[PDB]
Design a protein around this ligand. Structure first.
Ligand SMILES: Nc1ncnc2c1ncn2[C@@H]1O[C@H](COP(=O)(O)OP(=O)(O)OP(=O)(O)O)[C@@H](O)[C@H]1O
Ligand SMILES: Nc1ncnc2c1ncn2[C@@H]1O[C@H](COP(=O)(O)OP(=O)(O)OP(=O)(O)O)[C@@H](O)[C@H]1O
Ligand SMILES: Nc1ncnc2c1ncn2[C@@H]1O[C@H](COP(=O)(O)OP(=O)(O)OP(=O)(O)O)[C@@H](O)[C@H]1O
Ligand SMILES: Nc1ncnc2c1ncn2[C@@H]1O[C@H](COP(=O)(O)OP(=O)(O)OP(=O)(O)O)[C@@H](O)[C@H]1O
Ligand SMILES: Nc1ncnc2c1ncn2[C@@H]1O[C@H](COP(=O)(O)OP(=O)(O)OP(=O)(O)O)[C@@H](O)[C@H]1O
Lengths: 362, 362, 362, 362, 362
DNA sequence: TTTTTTTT
């Protein structure tokens, strides 16, 4: 009796698997009797134990197949096709709505029965970030708007300050939240072709540490980034499509995603100052260092740099109406759980401790 | 029974879809009951909802096939082959009548029963655009004719002027009108010597932000582009056909399209000046800023960058005589609606509001 | 019943089509009934309407094939194999037979139904060229047959006159007539090696105006260019093969093609001077330049840079018995066309205008 | 009858083989009579002699197959697919316990009765290592935690000291313990592209003997290592994912591994001190050298370089609780075996011999 | 009925054809009705007309095949396989007999009834060559024997003398006779490495015009070649294998083949002098240039560059026993033709007339 | 056959 390629493709759709090897590896695990599947019994991976019983019968036949890689290839192509269809038809608003559902699904697991995440430690992170700048949650909403609206020539935010001032920590959390990618421009001009190629079909991008010149005035080593960026105004402006690379592949042509650039205190040509719609400056603060020193689970679990921490901040601080109609349903459930499990006094005790530079918990 | 690759390819032709993954994904949607189909019920996407009922039966059989990418590859190749046969056999006017049919079909949808936008906003756009430069509508008709007759040497156009003078905005609108592609000239030539290969089978191209020495005193760094374009005489003059590059695929040789170059105000070598038909000398125009500020919907919906706005302008301004007979039928029929939906006093009142720096609507 | 692969191959041979997508696109059109075929009715394209009725039955069955691109790939291989067999086997004269026909085929278009070129202004080019120097149709015929015979040492002509005296412009016209390419030698010696690689397999070559040292005093741009040529003894003589080089690619051996050198009036080592068959003075002549200034279509349509204008000069002046033995027949309808379109008196009047320096058609 | 592909896939999995040729060559050996297999009888290779009898029947049929390389390719994919599944789903602690279990398995052979090694010599090596630095075993534990926790911007240790002072010796042992790669960055900036590609999916990296610039008064050569590192800040900090390269392969996104930098006595920017968690100063010491000369079987067998030696040190020194839970059973058994075979006096005698610079053994 | 792949393999072998496209093209020509074949009837290409009559029936069936290129690929592989087998197993003696048989076949054509050149024209060539140096025939016999034995150290011959003194003329004819490559070592040390790669798997190499440094006392321009050669001593001595490299490609290891060195009368190191078997001095002699000046068909037909002329000289001068037994029958036939064609009186008249420096013929 | 190499 033959393998159902249909059942395989459906698993890859359900789990959104992009990699033929990852798909192959995981589907093989289903060959063993789910009745005794130690992994299922220990509930260690949703993408396994949700599926093993359903796929077991087909996986036994797949284990014998001589075609295996071909079956997986067709499955991955279907998931890739679904992505291109979506990328060419969704509004950016709908795209963000989908991303939030993915994160909320992960949160339901993290704080779920398996429950590995202590929501107390995660909410401590929210207090730390809300402390990092005035009106923090308002600034996040402004960033989200302009990423959604993607207004031409008003498309990039500039993060500037001295070192150890948290700007890349914030950028990392924002980047996880929207699911962009990071890129280098402190490079020779040739290499940029395949480098910038990975921006293909991403929602957002981040450029790090772009280097000005004469920076040794400020002990900054002078470098390529700023002058490479003035060579790229059109990619910033997003006013027209551009052509993007891959090895062993043709171009694809598209408008280039919006995003964020991070800066030591170099000087900048005003052609670029014209193009950054907004700038915010970060400045070091002693009590934050003391707090982290007392509370290193914030770093060790990477809480302060996760988009999950930003999402919790928004759920706490923003009206339900600021979210799209579909997710408002889930937003309501999460607002309930947070309010129930964190009395305002608890959060105030936390935010107090952070401001004092004390260990957040007491 | 078995998949009709014929019915597949008919969809590919009729959608003009020429991406194998896009096609693959698109067709797979039809596997579900069209009678229940939520996208059909929404009338969400024309390239779905017109076809779902027709292709449903074949797509069910497609959904079980094991040849799925191979089926799509043949289907895409007939679409691409059709473009090739057209690209040599059709006369340039005939090409434009095809392109204008394409844009009119979109306009039929946009201002269709969905009212996906309101033409009042787009006509405010027409007013804002015609407000840019003297006799604006007329200059476009001259440029169109230059690209039609494609006369050698007198074959390229310069836009010169400061940032936020709108030259890129004009360029974006013209390219969205014609179809064609952009390129960057500010490169080492042996890099550009592959990128020029993009021009294949295109009607038009545009070259962005040429840089040269003698700008750098004005926050306007020099670049290779000025000398590159001075040297790219073949591509410019169009007095002969030239090679165009590809990867894992053969080159071809053909006439290089006509086109436009944009500059901020570097110098120009006189022989390169002499290779233009014309130059146009963009400026700030202060009250437009004020209008735009109120008129945020203009940029949010990208109206003033989009060739659809130009098409509404030429319909509004030009004699019905300016077009080929078959489209003159559609021109007349569509030109009716503008009276049904505007008085001239409204159009006057709009351009007045523009001139007055008001929000265009009242 | 089945696709004849044979019939597809015949059509590819008859079209001499060497593009698989083009062949695919073309042949698919025959699947509709030839009996109504509107391209046939309109007699638009012989490569269609000559063939449809024969191929129709096979094209229908072809359109149902699942293998289509494979059929076409074999057909294109056949045409490429044919070219390679001939390319190895045939003589310089037989190859000249080809580029002759290619140039006549272009003229049948350029002055055909489109009227894209004004045959009068182009024959006025023939006149203006013919008055540069003595008997120019003979001077061409002498040079041309010299390039066919490719006799060792007897292979290179020198142009030596001051600026604007025509050598560059003439060299351009010569290249259009012939194909081939020009070359730079005004260089440090390392560069010459890849430069010379351009000559590989060219039917003719040129050397760009030499930086002759012994030009310093003449206020000419000057240097090793001439001493490089004097050093490169053997390549000109072409008695024996030599190696040639391309970047990122291996060495190759050729008899170095025959060609032309041009200069302003440098002083010359008589060793190098002894290598030439002819050296030709050029004088700037007021009547020539002022006629051009009165006749600028000659420049704008680059008629004087047209090698096709040289082919007209052959067709007009030279006797039928001088052209390629059988293709002489094809020349006579061209002579007949020109003889009908142009009395000798109008060509004479034309020459008499430039004989007054008056614009040719004035 | 037919080949069981499944049995081949099992053999690949059981041997964890992932070279197609190694797998092929290995499997082919089973085709001869198991009952006479001299390799089995001589008990030379366990990956042979465990398996020949099981696989024999299928190996004979495989020997006749016409598909041999395709059969092997599917088997190697299965092993590679498992590695990627693990790379995404395992915790860093689990990865380390898997690595430990494999070393412990290798130790079981070496000190098996069939084993070649002498546990007294291997224990002698531990005495030399525990003399190389203060509190050596505690330093190993602190480093292991540092790599398991992988705390961003607290991920890298700096080894520096004179030449012939044991830094690369110690790095090699840690690298064999954990698995990882060494890398060279005293390079031109371009080859760094592919060089950093080597880090892909590794656990550790070691940057070996980076060169500073200047201060050749220190007798140090100069090179670009430190100037490259001061650029590569993002790869050290490990705050965000980066994109890595391989020849003929498209760019791969992951967070960059933690690791070690080794360096002779160059001075260093504080910008790089700011990125190293800890700095260890190695020093040359006479009694180590004098002991080592008399104890040179240590060198001959590479005992001092090898991760087995560090693992033995941890088993001797560390409490059982510090090992992850599942291995505590095996660790206890090895502790008992060590105690059975060495008194404290023997170990303490060895250390005294090392301190006295006599040969370790007596 | 079916294609015989064997018949295609045989044709490919007898024609020694290496190109798929070439073989494909050739074989398709046999499908047209053999009896009418104008190519047969003109008797031009022997690789056609010797075979068309035989292969005709198979060519018809091949013309209908669906997998034609696969047939031709296998045939070409058979030809390529035999070449590598021979490269590894032939004696140098046998290689030369094979090389000679090829030339003898071309001579049977050139002087057959269809032969376009005339044997009297070529015997004029032999007479002129015999006058260039004393004992010319015996010199050539010695040189060939030297290459055939390839005795180490006794491997290389030196040509020196003024410009236009015939040294490269002779090298060309020898290289045409034996097969091989020229090389240029007037280079910096880096470029030599790829240059020496040209020698890979050749029979001879010629180092052309290695310049010495200094010696402008003789007006010889200085250059590095001689200094480069004195480093390369081991390549010349030929006593042990060397490593050779090519662009994009690996090393190869082999004995560097024997060859010829040419130059003007530079100084020599005594070390380099000792590495040569013989020095042969060239000098201008006026009666040769006056003879050429009155028999330029020698140059025009490139007779004196040709190894065919050398082979003709060997046949005229040397005993039958000096040839290898395999070809002695063809040699005797060719001698008998020549003796019947020319009386000694004719040849003696030619030689004397050349000594008078008059045109060869009377 | 690109990409890597080579060109630089
Ligand atoms: N505002 C701040 N004041 C004091 N310490 C800070 C602040 N922000 C971050 N930190 C500390 O600095 C560490 C590094 O933060 P981060 O990498 O985000 O800084 P950065 O300025 O963006 O750095 P870089 O320019 O090197 O990328 C954090 O882990 C935290 O310990
Ligand atoms: N003539 C104008 N006067 C004032 N503002 C203008 C004008 N034209 C455009 N703008 C503003 O500048 C923005 C950018 O316009 P656009 O990119 O077309 O200008 P540009 O001159 O081509 O600029 P750049 O050289 O930076 O690409 C527009 O979206 C609009 O907000
Ligand atoms: N003999 C001539 N007398 C006058 N005008 C001429 C003559 N020959 C050419 N012309 C015109 O002068 C232009 C420039 O001529 P051209 O570049 O061919 O001269 P050149 O001798 O090669 O010059 P240069 O040495 O400056 O490059 C031509 O394109 C043509 O328009
Ligand atoms: N602390 C030490 N005291 C004395 N001799 C030492 C010491 N460490 C190493 N040696 C000797 O130096 C040899 C080389 O050791 P190793 O290669 O680790 O040196 P290194 O200085 O750390 O090298 P590198 O600079 O290349 O990393 C050892 O085999 C041993 O003979
Ligand atoms: N010995 C000679 N006496 C007189 N004329 C000669 C002699 N040898 C060659 N020639 C003339 O010189 C021309 C060039 O000959 P050739 O290329 O062989 O000279 P070469 O000195 O060996 O050259 P090169 O310096 O390039 O190695 C010949 O075609 C002939 O006209």
């Amino acid at each position: 009796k033959q393998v159902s390629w249909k059942l395989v493709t459906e698993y890859a759709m359900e789990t959104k698997c992009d990699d033929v090897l990852l798909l192959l590896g995981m589907y093989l695990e289903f060959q063993y009797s789910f009745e005794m599947c130690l992994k299922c019994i220990k509930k260690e991976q949703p993408s396994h134990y949700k599926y093993h019983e359903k796929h077991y019968a087909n996986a036994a036949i797949f284990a014998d197949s001589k075609n295996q890689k071909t079956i997986c290839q067709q499955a991955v192509d279907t998931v890739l096709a679904k992505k291109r269809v979506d990328s060419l038809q969704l509004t950016r608003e709908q795209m963000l709505t989908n991303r939030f559902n993915d994160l909320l699904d992960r949160m339901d697991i993290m704080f779920g029965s398996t429950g590995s995440a202590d929501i107390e430690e995660w909410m401590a992170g929210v207090a730390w970030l809300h402390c990092l700048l005035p009106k923090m949650d308002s600034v996040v909403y402004d960033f989200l708007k302009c990423m959604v609206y993607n207004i031409p020539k008003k498309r990039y935010w500039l993060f500037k300050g001295p070192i150890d001032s948290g700007k890349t920590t914030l950028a990392a959390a924002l980047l996880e939240l929207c699911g962009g990618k990071a890129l280098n421009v402190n490079l020779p001009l040739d290499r940029l072709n395949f480098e910038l190629g990975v921006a293909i079909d991403q929602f957002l991008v981040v450029f790090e540490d772009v280097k000005g010149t004469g920076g040794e005035s400020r002990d900054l080593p002078s470098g390529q980034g700023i002058n490479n960026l003035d060579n790229l105004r059109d990619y910033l402006d997003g006013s027209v499509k551009v052509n993007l690379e891959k090895k062993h592949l043709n171009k694809r042509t598209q408008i280039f995603p919006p995003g964020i650039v991070t800066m030591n205190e170099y000087s900048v040509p005003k052609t670029l100052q014209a193009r950054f719609v907004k700038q915010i400056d970060f400045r070091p603060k002693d009590y934050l260092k003391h707090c982290l020193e007392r509370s290193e689970f914030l770093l060790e679990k990477r809480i302060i740099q996760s988009g999950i921490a930003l999402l919790l901040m928004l759920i706490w601080y923003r009206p339900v109406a600021e979210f799209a109609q579909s997710i408002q349903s889930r937003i309501v459930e999460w607002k309930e759980r947070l309010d129930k499990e964190f009395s305002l006094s608890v959060y105030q005790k936390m935010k107090f401790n952070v401001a004092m530079g004390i260990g957040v918990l007491d």
